[PDB]
UniProtKB/Swiss-Prot annotation, chain A:
Substrate-recognition component of a Cul2-RING (CRL2) E3 ubiquitin-protein ligase complex of the DesCEND (destruction via C-end degrons) pathway, which recognizes a C-degron located at the extreme C terminus of target proteins, leading to their ubiquitination and degradation. The C-degron recognized by the DesCEND pathway is usually a motif of less than ten residues and can be present in full-length proteins, truncated proteins or proteolytically cleaved forms. Widely expressed. Highly expressed in testis. Weakly expressed in other tissues. Changing residue 126 to A: Abolished ability to promote ubiquitination of target proteins such as GLI1. Component of a CRL2 E3 ubiquitin-protein ligase complex, also named ECS (Elongin BC-CUL2/5-SOCS-box protein) complex, composed of CUL2, Elongin BC (ELOB and ELOC), RBX1 and substrate-specific adapter FEM1B. Homooligomer. Interacts with PPM1F and PHTF1. Interacts with the death domain of FAS/TNFRSF6 and TNFRSF1A. Interacts with CHEK1. Interacts with NKX3-1. Belongs to the fem-1 family. ANK repeats lie at residues 12-56, 60-97. The lineage of its organism: Eukaryota, Metazoa, Chordata, Craniata, Vertebrata. This is Protein fem-1 homolog B.
UniProtKB/Swiss-Prot annotation, chain B:
It comes from Homo sapiens (Human). Belongs to the Elongin B family. The chain holds residues 2 to 100 of 118 of the full protein. This is Elongin-B. It is found in: Nucleus. The keyword Transcription regulation applies. GO terms for biological process: positive regulation of proteasomal ubiquitin-dependent protein catabolic process; protein ubiquitination; protein-containing complex assembly; target-directed miRNA degradation; transcription elongation by RNA polymerase II; transcription initiation at RNA polymerase II promoter.
From Swiss-Prot, chain D:
This is Cullin-2. It comes from the Eukaryota. The Cullin neddylation domain restrains the RING domain of RBX1 in the E3 ubiquitin-protein ligase complex; this restraint is removed upon neddylation of the cullin. It is found in: Nucleus. Core component of multiple cullin-RING-based ECS (ElonginB/C-CUL2/5-SOCS-box protein) E3 ubiquitin-protein ligase complexes, which mediate the ubiquitination of target proteins. CUL2 serves as a rigid scaffold in the complex and may contribute to catalysis through positioning of the substrate and the E2 ubiquitin-conjugating enzyme. The E3 ubiquitin-protein ligase activity of the complex is dependent on the neddylation of the cullin subunit and is inhibited by the association of the deneddylated cullin subunit with TIP120A/CAND1. The lineage of its organism: Eukaryota, Metazoa, Chordata, Craniata, Vertebrata. The gene is CUL2. Neddylated; which enhances the ubiquitination activity of ECS (Elongin BC-CUL2/5-SOCS-box protein) E3 ubiquitin-protein ligase complexes. Neddylation leads to structural rearrangment in the complex that allows interaction between the E2 ubiquitin-conjugating enzyme and the acceptor ubiquitin. CBC(VHL) complex formation seems to promote neddylation. Deneddylated via its interaction with the COP9 signalosome (CSN) complex. Belongs to the cullin family.
Curated annotation (Swiss-Prot), chain E:
Widely expressed. The chain holds residues 24 to 104 of 108 of the full protein. A zinc finger (RING-type) spans 30-67. Changing residue 30 to A: Strong reduction in ligase activity. Changing residue 60 to E: Impairs UBE2R2 activation by neddylated Cul2-RING(FEM1C) complex. The RING-type zinc finger domain is essential for ubiquitin ligase activity. It coordinates an additional third zinc ion. Coiled coil: none annotated. It comes from Homo sapiens (Human). E3 ubiquitin ligase component of multiple cullin-RING-based E3 ubiquitin-protein ligase (CRLs) complexes which mediate the ubiquitination and subsequent proteasomal degradation of target proteins, including proteins involved in cell cycle progression, signal transduction, transcription and transcription-coupled nucleotide excision repair. CRLs complexes and ARIH1 collaborate in tandem to mediate ubiquitination of target proteins, ARIH1 mediating addition of the first ubiquitin on CRLs targets. Keywords: Acetylation, Cytoplasm, DNA damage, DNA repair, Host-virus interaction, Metal-binding, Nucleus, Phosphoprotein, Transferase, Ubl conjugation pathway, Zinc, Zinc-finger. This is E3 ubiquitin-protein ligase RBX1.
Length: 156, 96, 96, 83, 73
């Protein structure tokens, strides 16, 4: 918890939750390969219980949910992949937010299994649909909406 | 699972029913939730009368036509039958 | 069982109570003082939102109740560009 | 007994997959083995389970080479190599 | 009805269940891979282990269940 409250970030904006989610996180060639395998659902669940910023994005804009859907091994460790998508959504990660390239994690799922899991765990809301329609039609939303909703249009 | 947006001047009622059913129970439920005599229900689809015994699936809307995302309007002018005076929704402002 | 939603521009909308309790703000409005326990009207007066956005949020209520959990066949919500940026603030107010 | 023999044959089926998985693991740890050397090693590695009959292992051997998981060498039938 | 108790055989919602090469499930490892992987799907809704698919395409360009030319995803 003390380390999370500093919000540590790598070169490419990766928070401590993103690296525990990303499969590209390096593992040392020594005995750490036998234990520390990423993504790990226990690490993500412990970090979310300790108060990790689940909606935090990197420099590219990908959230914690944007990297877990990009996992290229959906069935080999499906027990890990299922137990981490549920944890992120239950923590409060948006299932509709977009990165700087304006890509939904459904669009960046690149996998039938991850898309199925996410769509099962999506909680549909009118605010997300309206914000997606606003962003799709490129409507001028500056100074016409509450300031607490400008960010909402920003990532949706 | 047909979905209807019953209109009467300004009042609007959203109702769920089945494809193959009569409008008898539809008139009865709108009577129950409107607190009006049950003899003034004259349902109108696209400003025309319809039979009170014919199924509503053949009346002009179905599952592919009437949806929860976009229900079909059904005027419900009451006998004082009054003329159809369905007030349209307010137009959105002219976007730049 | 049925609640009433009144827009700023005189329009009245009636939807099922379970359909309208999916938004937190309407649930808060129905709770507290002035429940008006007639079990048929429970009328809430929205003094700000226009009629078209209220119609769209009622359609959203029905749409979400129908598709709260289903198969992959989830049809998209038909949001017009003109009704957006006014339904977004409406959903913010309603906490939909 | 109509369904008891099904569980007496399901164990026979799972015997074949466990025998085939045993030969792949044993041979590729050495990359080459004789016929008698592999047969004794298959039995010794499956003592905490069924006692495998000699006819079943050689039946799993001839299936395995046909599946191109292992290959019989060019010397004789008493020389097996991985592939 | 008064009272009813049943049993449910819950399984994961993946459409494909087992690799029909090694007669093994897809959740665990293949026979080539156990001794010490990724899953390869097909255009004809045929999903197997990566090592099993590699060996099968090394044998012939025919899908393991039907006479169809194997393709990647
Ligand atoms: Zn493998
Ligand atoms: Zn396999
Ligand atoms: Zn195939």
């Amino acid at each position: 918890y003390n380390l999370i409250h500093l919000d540590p970030r790598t070169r490419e904006g990766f928070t401590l939750l993103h690296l525990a989610v990303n499969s590209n996180t390096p593992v040392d060639d020594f005995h750490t390969n036998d234990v520390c395998s990423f993504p790990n659902a226990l690490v993500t669940k412990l970090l979310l219980d300790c108060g990790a910023e689940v909606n935090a994005v990197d420099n590219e804009g990908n959230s914690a949910l944007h990297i877990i859907v990009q996992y290229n091994r959906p069935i080999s460790d499906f027990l890990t992949l299922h137990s981490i998508i549920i944890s992120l959504v239950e923590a409060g990660a948006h299932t509709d937010m977009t990165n700087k390239q304006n890509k939904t994690p459904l669009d960046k799922s690149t996998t039938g299994v991850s898309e199925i899991l996410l769509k099962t765990q999506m909680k549909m809301s009118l605010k997300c649909l309206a914000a997606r329609a606003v962003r799709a039609n490129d409507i001028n939303y500056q100074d016409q909406i509450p300031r607490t909703l400008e960010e909402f249009v920003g990532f949706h | 699972d047909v979905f209807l947006m019953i209109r009467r001047h300004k009042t609007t009622i959203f109702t769920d029913a089945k494809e193959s059913s009569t409008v008898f129970e539809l008139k009865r439920i709108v009577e129950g939730i409107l607190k009006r005599p049950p003899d003034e229900q004259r349902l109108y689809k696209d400003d025309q009368l319809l039979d009170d015994g014919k199924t509503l699936g053949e009346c002009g809307f179905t599952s592919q036509t009437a949806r929860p995302q976009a229900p079909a309007t059904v005027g419900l002018a009451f006998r004082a039958f009054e003329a159809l005076c369905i007030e349209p929704f307010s137009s959105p402002p002219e976007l730049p | 069982m049925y609640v009433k939603l009144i827009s700023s521009d005189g329009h009245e909308f009636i939807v099922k109570r379970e359909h309208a309790l999916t938004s937190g703000t309407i649930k808060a409005m129905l709770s507290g003082p002035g429940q008006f326990a007639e079990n048929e009207t429970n009328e809430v007066n929205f003094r700000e939102i226009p009629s078209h956005v209220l119609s769209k949020v009622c359609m959203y209520f029905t749409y979400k109740v129908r598709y709260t959990n289903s198969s992959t066949e989830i049809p998209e919500f038909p949001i017009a560009p003109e009704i957006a940026l006014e339904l977004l603030m409406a959903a913010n107010f309603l906490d939909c | 007994p109509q369904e008891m023999e099904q569980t007496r044959s399901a164990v026979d089926e799972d015997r074949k997959m466990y025998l085939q998985a045993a030969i792949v693991r044993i041979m590729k740890a050495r990359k080459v083995l004789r016929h008698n050397a592999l047969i004794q090693e298959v039995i010794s590695q499956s003592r905490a389970r069924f006692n495998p009959s000699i006819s079943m292992i050689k039946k799993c051997i001839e299936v395995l080479i046909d599946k191109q998981y292992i290959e019989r060498s060019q010397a004789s039938a008493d020389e097996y190599s991985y592939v | 009805v008064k009272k009813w108790n049943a049993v449910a055989l819950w399984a994961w919602d993946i459409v494909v269940d087992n690799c029909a090469i090694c007669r093994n499930h897809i959740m665990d490892l293949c026979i080539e891979c156990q001794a010490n992987c990724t899953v390869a799907w097909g255009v004809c809704n045929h999903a197997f282990h990566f090592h099993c698919i590699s060996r099968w395409l090394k044998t012939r360009q025919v899908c393991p269940l039907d006479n169809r030319e194997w393709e990647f995803q």
